[PDB]
């Protein structure tokens, strides 16, 4: 079916906007992406910068996964990001997230030939 490479993009991208569209956001955004359909995903990070900005990531700062793999990367400039994190007050199947907007660092785990994203290890 469908790629790591594609997950990725589907899971964490959405260059369509620069900043944390409305306190919404989020309850839209893991909706639409699929994220919601089988539980809660309790937290999700979408990057607002062109999927080529992001691609890039791949070449820059070599930085220790949180699974102790060695395949992550740190951006070296900051990027435009919205947080997603899952309310107490949620309810499978009405998953309520908060939105917050950030311009941070953020950490992806890269794999294969293209070298590409593969999962979001982390903001910082
Ligand atoms: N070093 C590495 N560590 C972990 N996985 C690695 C890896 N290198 C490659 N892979 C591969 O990527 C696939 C997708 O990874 P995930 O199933 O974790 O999907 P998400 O990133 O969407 O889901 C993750 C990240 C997200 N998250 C966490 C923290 C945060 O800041 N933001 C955010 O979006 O929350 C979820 C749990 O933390 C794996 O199956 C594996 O084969």
Redesign the pocket.
Known sequence: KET?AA??ER??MDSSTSAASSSNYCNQMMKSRNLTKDRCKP???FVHESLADVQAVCSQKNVA???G?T??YQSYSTMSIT?CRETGSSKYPNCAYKTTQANKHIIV?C?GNPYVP??????V
Do not use: G, I
């Not at 593969?118 to 903001?123: E, G, I, P, R, T």
């Open positions: 790591a997950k990725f899971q964490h937290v999700n990070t996964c949180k699974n793999q395949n992550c947080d785990a794999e593969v999962h979001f290890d982390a903001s």
